[PDB]
């Protein structure tokens, strides 16, 4: 866990992009490479294309998902089994 004293981490990149999107009231698919920004209530309804390293995965943000770093929801390695 990031300590409280620092406050939650969101890179300025998608902070700016998501602000522009929800001020114009338009909900788009935003293309992000940042796995490391935690989710804020500002992000609550939007959709994200996050990088899994091979591609961009669709992620619909909901209420239950706040408190979590984004790339949690785009898995990385593919395991089908043997």
């Amino acid at each position: 866990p990031r300590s409280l004293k620092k406050g939650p981490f969101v890179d300025d990149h998608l902070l700016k992009k998501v602000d522009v999107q929800n001020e114009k009231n338009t909900k788009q698919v935003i293309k992000t490479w940042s796995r490391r920004s935690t989710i804020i209530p500002d992000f609550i309804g939007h959709t994200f294309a996050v990088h899994d390293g091979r591609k961009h995965v669709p992620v619909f943000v909901t209420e239950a998902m706040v408190g979590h770093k984004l790339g949690e929801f785009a898995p990385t390695r593919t395991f089908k089994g043997h």
């Binding site: 409280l4 406050g7 939650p8 804020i40 209530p41 609550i44 209420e63 239950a64 998902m65 706040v66 408190g67």
Partner: peptide, 11 residues
Amino acid sequence: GRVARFEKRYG
């Protein structure tokens, strides 16, 4: 209510 749990921490 996960967002309230969020705001208690940081706010």
